[PDB]
Design a protein around this nucleic acid. Structure first.
Lengths: 31, 131, 122, 48
RNA sequence: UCGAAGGUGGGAUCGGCGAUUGGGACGAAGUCGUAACAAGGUAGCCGUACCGGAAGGUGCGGCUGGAUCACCUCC
RNA sequence: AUCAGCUUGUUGGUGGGGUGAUGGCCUACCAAGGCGACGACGGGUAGCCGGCCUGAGAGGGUGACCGGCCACACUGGGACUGAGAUACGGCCCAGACUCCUACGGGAGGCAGCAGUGGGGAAUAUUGCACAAUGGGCGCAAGCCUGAUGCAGCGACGCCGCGUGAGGGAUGACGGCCUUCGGGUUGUAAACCUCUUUCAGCACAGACGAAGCGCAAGUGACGGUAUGUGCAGAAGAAGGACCGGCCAACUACGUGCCAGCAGCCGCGGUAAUACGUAGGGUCCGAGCGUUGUCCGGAAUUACUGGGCGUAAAGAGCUCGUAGGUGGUUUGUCGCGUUGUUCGUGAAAACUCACAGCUUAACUGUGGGCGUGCGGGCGAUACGGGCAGACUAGAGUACUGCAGGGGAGACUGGAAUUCCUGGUGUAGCGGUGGAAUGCGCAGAUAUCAGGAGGAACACCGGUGGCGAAGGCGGGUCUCUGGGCAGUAACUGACGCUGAGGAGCGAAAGCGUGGGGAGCGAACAGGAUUAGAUACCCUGGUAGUCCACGCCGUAAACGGUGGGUACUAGGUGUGGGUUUCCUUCCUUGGGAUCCGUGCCGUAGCUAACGCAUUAAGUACCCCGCCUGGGGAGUACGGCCGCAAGG
RNA sequence: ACUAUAACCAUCCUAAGGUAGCGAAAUUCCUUGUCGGGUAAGUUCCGACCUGCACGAAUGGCGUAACGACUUCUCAACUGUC
RNA sequence: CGGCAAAAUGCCCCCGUAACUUCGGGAGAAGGGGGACCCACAUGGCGUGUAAGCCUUUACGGCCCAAGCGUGAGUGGGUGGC
């Protein structure tokens, strides 16, 4: 299997983790 | 573990047939002997006999090949199996190879072929197909 | 799968995507033109496609395509819209029926007249 | 086409209560003796 | 006595709007950089942690879905 | 189940009450039950069926007409009368709405037939008759019947018919194309005969009524259908399409425009794809478009699919419910199977026949109604019951190999630092350097000391473990495996939804420890820029104890069990016959592992191939185009990260 | 690629140029900042924006269940507070 | 300036209680129902305990126990007042 699919999935995962890091305190205070 | 002795018998026959063996041995039981009887009487196998084994008895089957080494059996399929079992009435008995094959049916009158069961007006469990 | 797995879970068919949800089970709907304008298609093609913004009777705001050569549609014009997709335009699934209600049949049409609401010449 | 084994609970009525738990009992239908009670104990085939 | 409707009360549950705010898809030609594909010029990717305008970098463990190993003298 | 708990007249008993009738139907007392992952309790949607449409069938969608059952009658409660009540055109109350009122109070209920307004893309006449059939009352005549029988309107559907037929040419005119020759429209037309279907006019005129009536008559349809005459081809054709799928091509106009398009895709001055004209094709009182369902789609695969790399094997085990199960004897007749009886309304469907001038349509008679209930027959298989056996499974005994696991103690090399000699001016680092260290005596060399971590050679495609994983030594405790004997039990097996446990590294908590390495962080260098690669330092962390986490390219990208299907050759563990020195991998045989090459077979191919991805059987997990997204919302778990 | 800002670049200075988080704040002068909510009417109050005159990580930063004769705002009830 | 001060709630027994949470709380959350007297069940139940009775290692003994004294809670009916 091409590593292209792994690359797409990893970019999605990395962006989501970055978003989670950027809004940790906001999420904690809203929940 | 072993679940279907009948299917194991059929697969021993099929595997020996593909390998052009002249001989196939397996543990003996009444049902397997009756299936061997039907196969021999219908001319699919050469001959069968039952020796005795170390514990019980064995079944020995001679495979029939033509002069140019062409197999006398074209296929062997198990129809009714543990889990999903198949029963047919006397009127909707299956046809094998458009009638060119033989379907073995277990009726209360014993083991019969599809044509015998149709002629006698009986039904039962469809054990296997031979063609 | 196994027969037992089938009797335990069965087979579930794929769900069907509903097309033209704004029609709400009707072959046609009547709407009023929120705004009549023009737009450019996808990249491979190029034109000035004529598109109307229609507010249907099913309370759905929908963008519809105007077939034919010339049209006489302006604001607050009652039209009858149907289903039909235009490949070039991204999100247009409806076409305005020519020759019904305010919208007029095209002019000087002599072939496929019934598809553009142009009467037979006398 | 597979043969499926399903289980069902019925409530029977026995006067003297001679039937314990685990006994193969025989039942016969009857008119409603109460809500949910529609069977009458005939006899115990084999205790256990 | 029961009893529809009505009144009081505290909760369930389904939707709409919401100043502000997050990401997603698409958009010839804008800006910034070169991350991947040939050993892509630091092999790549998986989990995890930290860090960084951004792709990304680095640590620990793992995988091959990673390329090259010339000449090589005795027999 | 992104709804796991629900129930207190609720589950049962007794005595009463109540009812046409049994019954927590109601009631007093008593007991504590009842239902639920075979999905209770919630949420959403829905009148059910004969049937209808689609399909080869299985199946899928549906419940229009006609036919059966249920429910309701402005909304919500209630009873009364009665043989019978959701009492549509009954009653009582409450409510909303509409109307009358002398303000005290009253009236109303189209989801009956027409009709109106509104909503909508969209669905009809405020018609005729009780002549026929059915119903109510009456002894009866008779009366009532918007049930019903008819008519009106709408190509809304199915079916049928017509718009003419024969003859008619070097094939007229016109059109269009042209190679300028001519070709096509085209036997088409014009003309010559013939026939009039259907419409139009005239005349006659029904059946439906073995009916009703003891009156003399009685048909709503209807003076209709129909029949006979009259005249004349006379009054009667449009729609879509023509690049390929997919029958049917040329010219002119326009030029990335205007536009077309179901998909592929067509528009760039010479388009068979746009527009228009000739021609053509397919249908035809229709032809197309849109909406919806089935088919094609084997694209949810029972018939009839898959999971090494395309989407798809849980990280691995144990085990609950469940599913499934070796050889054999007897019995039951639950499944299975044969036959018979009852039922499966009619209509519909199919076969045959009959009647409408045919057809649609209608009637008659079979079949169908794939099922269920009762009796009778069979016992091969499945199952139950009662036994038996040892080939599976397990125990016993004798040996065997191993980094399997836990604890305790302990060894040596090397790195680092500290102390003391000798000893000087560099050491260190790189592709090349610089930060840095040293001249306060560094690096080097020797002796001594402290401390932590990892265990060179053995050591490999070799061993063990379910997987993660596991090698300095010794001791203690402990798990599994294999071989042989076969002494013992006698099917005790397999798989396993959920569930429980284990689970690399990183990370988290508390307490220790910290030599080396080292995210972050500092400088140096490279660079256009270096939040990097390289250099010098370097904190968490790496280590120990006790707990959390629960993920990995947790991979053989290959779930577990079992049987069968050519061989050749390494290597690990163990038994045994024969060369025999019996030293020897002597060689063979056999059991259990672990590699390589290779048949048959399988696969899209690569490849797999007795350790299967071959041939089959049992059980589990998972897949259904790509993104959005393993993300949002809800929930559970976690200290958090997050899962 | 309209305009706007500036992910980006250059340059001077320093021991280093403020990170996470929060921000009209017990810090915000201008100021009753602006928008939203609440009221018939809200310089106070709550939510948000960031232009932080002059927040900011043990003179700790940001939160936080429970607690308070603390400060602030709103509602019901109750009343001679009116 | 500000509900300051007053008013209001207030007990017992039942029923029933939200967000959030450090799982302990929040909580007396909130919100609601009954409460007098007489009679009957009822010479009832409960406590105590004498005589009687039973038992024993017999005594400053144990058990039980009519009578007597004390006492709730409930159920049903009735009575009176704002």
């Amino acid at each position: 299997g091409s590593v292209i699919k792994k690359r797409r999935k990893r970019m999605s995962k990395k962006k989501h983790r970055k978003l989670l890091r950027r809004t940790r305190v906001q999420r904690r205070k809203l929940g | 573990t072993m679940t279907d002795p009948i299917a194991d018998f059929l697969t021993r026959l099929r595997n020996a047939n593909s390998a052009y063996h002249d001989e196939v041995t397996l543990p003996h039981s009444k049902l397997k002997a009756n299936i061997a009887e039907i196969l021999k009487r219908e001319g699919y196998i050469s001959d069968y006999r039952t020796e005795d084994a170390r514990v019980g008895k064995s079944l020995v089957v001679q495979l029939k090949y033509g002069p140019s080494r062409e197999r006398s059996i074209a296929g062997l399929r198990r129809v009714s199996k543990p889990g999903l079992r198949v029963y047919a009435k006397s009127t909707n008995l299956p046809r094998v190879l458009g009638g060119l094959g033989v379907a073995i049916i277990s009726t209360s009158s014993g083991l019969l072929t599809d044509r015998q069961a149709a002629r006698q007006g009986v039904g039962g469990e469809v054990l296997a197909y031979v063609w | 799968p196994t027969i037992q797995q089938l009797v335990r879970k069965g087979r579930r068919d794929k769900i069907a995507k509903v097309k033209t949800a704004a029609l709400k089970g009707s072959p046609q709907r009547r709407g009023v033109c929120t705004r009549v304008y023009t737009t450019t298609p996808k990249k491979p093609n190029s034109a000035l496609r004529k598109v109307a913004r229609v507010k249907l009777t099913s309370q759905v705001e929908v963008t519809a395509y105007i077939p034919g050569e010339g049209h006489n549609l302006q604001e607050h014009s009652m039209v009858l819209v149907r289903g039909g997709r235009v490949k070039d335009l991204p999100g247009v699934r409806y076409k305005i029926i020519r020759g019904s209600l305010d919208t007029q049949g095209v002019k000087n049409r002599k072939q496929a007249r019934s598809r553009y609401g142009a009467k037979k010449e006398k | 086409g597979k043969i499926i084994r399903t289980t069902k609970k019925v409530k029977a009525h026995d006067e003297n209560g001679e039937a314990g738990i685990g006994d193969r009992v025989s039942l016969m239908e009857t008119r409603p003796l109460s809500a949910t009670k529609r069977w009458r104990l005939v006899e115990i085939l084999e205790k256990a």
